[PDB]
Design an enzyme around this catalytic site. Structure first.
Site, PDB file in Angstrom:
ATOM      1  NE  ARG A  74      -3.750   2.297   2.066  1.00 33.04           N
ATOM      2  CZ  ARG A  74      -3.568   2.856   3.005  1.00 33.04           C
ATOM      3  NH1 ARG A  74      -3.549   3.198   4.399  1.00 33.04           N
ATOM      4  NH2 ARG A  74      -4.037   4.317   2.509  1.00 33.04           N
ATOM      5  CG  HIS A 118      -1.561   8.571   2.371  1.00 31.11           C
ATOM      6  ND1 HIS A 118      -1.755   7.924   3.178  1.00 31.11           N
ATOM      7  CD2 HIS A 118      -1.776  10.039   4.197  1.00 31.11           C
ATOM      8  CE1 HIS A 118      -1.421   7.977   4.089  1.00 31.11           C
ATOM      9  NE2 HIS A 118      -1.414   8.243   4.854  1.00 31.11           N
ATOM     10  CD  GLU A 163      -6.065   7.926   9.140  1.00 30.04           C
ATOM     11  OE1 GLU A 163      -6.627   8.265  10.598  1.00 30.04           O
ATOM     12  OE2 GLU A 163      -5.329   6.717   9.449  1.00 30.04           O
ATOM     13  CG  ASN A 290      -6.004   3.660   7.475  1.00 31.09           C
ATOM     14  OD1 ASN A 290      -5.936   2.252   7.334  1.00 31.09           O
ATOM     15  ND2 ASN A 290      -5.093   5.142   8.000  1.00 31.09           N
ATOM     16  CE1 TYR A 292      -0.848   2.891  13.383  1.00 28.02           C
ATOM     17  CE2 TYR A 292      -2.792   4.457  12.471  1.00 28.02           C
ATOM     18  CZ  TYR A 292      -1.713   3.703  12.251  1.00 28.02           C
ATOM     19  OH  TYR A 292      -0.901   3.958  10.643  1.00 28.02           O
ATOM     20  CD  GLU A 349      -2.704   4.409   7.905  1.00 28.99           C
ATOM     21  OE1 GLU A 349      -2.336   4.722   8.609  1.00 28.99           O
ATOM     22  OE2 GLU A 349      -2.345   4.868   6.050  1.00 28.99           O
TER      23      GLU A 349
END
Ligand code: NA
Length: 440
Positions: A74, A118, A163, A290, A292, A349
């Site tokens: 990616r 991005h 994002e 994504n 986290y 991610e």
């Protein structure tokens, strides 16, 4: 214990974070060139001017991905390399660069998963309000068209945006990402224009494509949990969940913007006609997550919007910059699967930052990162058991890089980058992923 035989296994990067060569071959100025060259914006005085030099050294990157046994990569295309003025002529040298990179990836057996946006907005567009202007949505779509026309004979899997919550809220409300504005209203406007650009681009890409594409969007999602069951803390959790998650998921799913959040934002909410909402909901082939961290929320009436603050848990592990909560990955996927229409899903991610160093033996002993992967992959197994249609996993990041407002100082790689010599070396967690993936 086993993932699907055809599961996608990769690592992820973004152009401004790794490429360097910021003035080479006709590249224009991005908002992150401007912002990183503004004193005080980056913690450690660094920029993306060189970064990992992956513009010249993507071969080395491919070497890492091969050594790791990955089957996918990616990465993002820099708009500034493709349309240096943002709205204007193309730069064939930019397109040829990524063309060669794509051919090199395919030659190595690595499927390219390309992100179009991005965060590297061309500065001339920002000069005309950037994502504060609807016109930027239109020209994003034109950029998307151009790229897919040239590379869509070889790349099937595309993401429009990465994002949008960051680009809108960190970029235009909180001021910590480029372009660095600090106005709620502009943040919310930016969110809508990002979403509209996404939807216009999807349509443009399908028309421009030489073969059917698998188009998605990539969202950062943060599962949110009230610190207590009080009405105050539960409502704070709902507000944070709306501010980050549902504000994007609902319109994409054809449900409009969430009405609770519209009422909360009041006069700062953007003007969103039904026609824009129809475009924003253009059917997708997949959704990237994504993941986290979680947010354990307490009411914070005196804080800025959304008036919800994190309640830290010192018994949980912490990395260089985040709290670790692997169960949140299962929770947010179960919610997507059961509550929303997007499928299949990819983890685009997942990863962590640590104070990595080269040890005396030459290795990087990042056990906490290994444990981080092992724990999150276990949650993915659980999610798969529950029927979640998950088709791939990408570690953030392939290598240490320029981590936005933290600069080079915050190392997320599964490979270590020596930023002076540009040598890369695989970390222990990288070797663990290699051997884990090879077992699969
Ligand atoms: Na720690």
């Amino acid at each position: 214990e086993r993932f699907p035989a055809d599961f996608v296994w990769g690592a992820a990067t973004a152009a401004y974070q790794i490429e360097g060569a910021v003035r080479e071959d006709g590249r224009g100025v991005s908002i992150w060139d401007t912002f990183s060259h503004t004193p005080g914006k980056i913690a450690d005085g660094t920029t993306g001017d060189v970064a990992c030099d992956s513009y010249h050294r993507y071969g080395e990157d491919i070497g890492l991905l091969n050594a790791l046994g990955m089957n996918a990569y990616r990465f993002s295309i820099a708009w500034p390399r493709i349309v240096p003025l943002g709205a204007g002529p193309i730069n064939q040298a930019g397109l040829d660069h990524y063309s060669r990179m794509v051919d090199a990836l395919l030659g190595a057996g690595l499927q390219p998963f390309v992100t179009l946006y991005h965060w590297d907005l061309p500065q001339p567009l920002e000069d005309r309000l950037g994502w504060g202007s609807r016109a930027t949505a239109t020209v994003f779509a034109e950029y998307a068209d151009i790229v897919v026309r040239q590379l869509g004979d070889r790349v099937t899997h595309w993401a429009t945006l990465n994002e949008p919550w960051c680009s809108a809220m960190l970029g235009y409300y909180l001021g910590v990402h480029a372009p660095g504005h600090t106005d709620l209203k502009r943040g919310l406007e930016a969110s809508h224009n990002l979403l509209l650009g996404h939807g216009l681009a999807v349509q443009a890409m399908r028309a421009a494509a030489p073969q059917p594409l698998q188009i998605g969007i990539v969202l950062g999602l943060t599962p949110t949990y009230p610190a207590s069951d009080s009405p105050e803390d539960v409502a704070a959790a709902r507000r944070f969940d709306g501010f980050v998650n549902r504000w994007f998921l609902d319109p994409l799913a054809g449900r409009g913007y969430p009405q609770d959040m519209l009422d909360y934002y009041g006069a700062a909410a953007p003007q969103a006609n039904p026609e824009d909402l129809t475009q924003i909901a253009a059917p997708l082939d997949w959704l990237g997550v994504n993941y986290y961290e979680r947010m354990r929320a307490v009411d914070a009436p005196d804080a800025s919007l959304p008036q919800a603050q994190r309640l830290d848990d010192p018994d949980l592990p912490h990395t260089a910059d985040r709290e670790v909560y692997p169960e949140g990955l299962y929770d947010i996927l179960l919610r997507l699967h059961n509550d929303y229409p997007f499928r299949p899903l990819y983890i685009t991610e997942n990863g962590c930052a640590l104070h990595d160093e080269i040890a005396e033996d030459g290795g990087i002993h990042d056990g906490q990162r290994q444990a981080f992967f092992e724990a999150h992959l276990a949650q993915l197994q659980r999610a798969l058991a529950a029927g979640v249609p998950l088709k791939g996993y990408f570690a953030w990041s392939l290598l240490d890089n320029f981590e936005w407002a933290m600069g080079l100082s915050m190392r997320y790689g599964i490979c270590y980058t020596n930023f002076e010599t540009l040598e890369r070396r695989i970390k222990d967690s990288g070797y663990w992923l290699r051997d884990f993936i090879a077992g699969q």
